Amino acid sequence: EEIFIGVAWPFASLDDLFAEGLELAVQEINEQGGVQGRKLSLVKADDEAELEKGLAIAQAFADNAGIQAVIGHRNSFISIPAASIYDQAGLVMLSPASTSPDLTDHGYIHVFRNIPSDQEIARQLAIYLAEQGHERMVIYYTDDSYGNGLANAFEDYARAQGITIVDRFNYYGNLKDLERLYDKWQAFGMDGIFIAKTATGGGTEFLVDAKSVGIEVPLIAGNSWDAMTAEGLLVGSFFNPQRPDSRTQDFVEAFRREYGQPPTSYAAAGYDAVILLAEALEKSDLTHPATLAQGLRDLGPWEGVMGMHRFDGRGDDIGDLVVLKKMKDGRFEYL
Ligand SMILES: CC(C)C[C@H](N)C(=O)O
Ligand SMILES: [Ca+2]
Ligand SMILES: [Ca+2]
Numbered sequence: 001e002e003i004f005i006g007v008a009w010p011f012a013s014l015d016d017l018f019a020e021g022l023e024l025a026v027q028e029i030n031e032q033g034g035v036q037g038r039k040l041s042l043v044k045a046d047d048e049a050e051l052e053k054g055l056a057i058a059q060a061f062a063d064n065a066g067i068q069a070v071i072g073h074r075n076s077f078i079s080i081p082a083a084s085i086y087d088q089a090g091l092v093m094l095s096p097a098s099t100s101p102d103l104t105d106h107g108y109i110h111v112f113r114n115i116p117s118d119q120e121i122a123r124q125l126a127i128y129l130a131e132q133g134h135e136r137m138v139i140y141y142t143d144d145s146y147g148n149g150l151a152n153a154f155e156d157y158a159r160a161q162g163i164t165i166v167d168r169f170n171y172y173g174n175l176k177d178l179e180r181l182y183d184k185w186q187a188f189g190m191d192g193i194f195i196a197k198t199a200t201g202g203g204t205e206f207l208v209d210a211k212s213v214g215i216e217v218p219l220i221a222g223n224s225w226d227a228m229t230a231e232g233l234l235v236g237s238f239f240n241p242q243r244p245d246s247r248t249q250d251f252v253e254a255f256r257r258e259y260g261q262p263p264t265s266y267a268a269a270g271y272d273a274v275i276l277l278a279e280a281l282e283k284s285d286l287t288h289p290a291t292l293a294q295g296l297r298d299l300g301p302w303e304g305v306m307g308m309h310r311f312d313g314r315g316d317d318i319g320d321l322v323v324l325k326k327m328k329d330g331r332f333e334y335l
């Protein structure tokens with residue numbers, strides 16, 4: 001009379017309205033009659049953004065015959081190894097936040113994300129920036145697999161747009177040396193900086209330091225920056241609450257009425273994940289969760305609050321889901 005979806009997320013450490021978006025979707029699914037006549041419930045586990053806790057949660061979900069699918073995890077360094085446990089168990093893992101390209105590069109069959117990867121975000125950013133007249137840019141990046149990853153993706157797409165990367169760097173010691181870098185960048189004709197560092201991983205510090213030194217050029221970053229020195233910052237992300245679409249607007253109004261504040265991109269990704277999984281589960285054999293992955297692929301294009309979703313053979317979401325967001329007066333405007 002009851003079925004369960006597992007959710008693994010750093011619930012306690014983040015004020016990101018993710019739980020609210022999940023809860024709104026579950027309420028909607030139950031109001032419409034549940035899944036195969038059964039009430040839908042969530043089993044929430046907090047991975048504290050820690051790999052060891054994440055792997056333990058993954059095994060606990062995988063060993064529980066009552067879990068039909070899992071939504072999670074948030075951080076790619078947890079989702080990638082946790083996905084091995086879910087994949088070997090034949091249990092769907094659907095991530096609403098992990099953007100590393102590597103997630104879908106391990107031959108897994110049960111592993112999905114319902115948001116664009118870093119590579120798709122980079123591709124759309126390069127297109128936009130070139131149309132805006134960028135020609136010579138600098139990349140500030142984290143010298144790890146994820147930082148090198150997004151940096152190399154952006155450089156490759158920017159090059160195809162006729163943008164030259166005139167310098168890339170991963171460290172500066174103090175503001176004086178950032179001044180010296182900015183002098184070199186001016187001599188190279190710099191017109192913008194792409195920050196391939198996460199906001200919590202040194203990104204925000206650079207933003208503040210850049211303003212101190214007087215760096216004038218546009219700053220561009222990826223999805224961790226969705227979560228007022230930032231005036232004019234361009235962010236490649238997902239979810240447009242101003243999208244003039246019935247589904248997006250029904251969600252925005254419902255979310256506002258229930259929770260008394262605007263939904264975040266994570267509330268939206270969580271909501272679409274629950275709705276997507278419930279639709280696939282309606283049509284599936286609930287006694288065999290290893291059949292659900294094919295059912296998700298069988299949906300083909302599927303309309304959600306984020307836009308149109310579609311899973312490919314590797315589990316990437318190839319829908320046109322990227323939304324470019326620009327900071328104006330402490331608020332994102334939507335391009
Ligand atoms: C929401 C982000 C901070 C998570 C990040 N996109 C990752 O893949 O790790
Ligand atoms: Ca199983
Ligand atoms: Ca050129």
Ligand SMILES: [Ca+2]
Nearest residue numbers: 167168169170
């Ligand atoms: Ca350099």
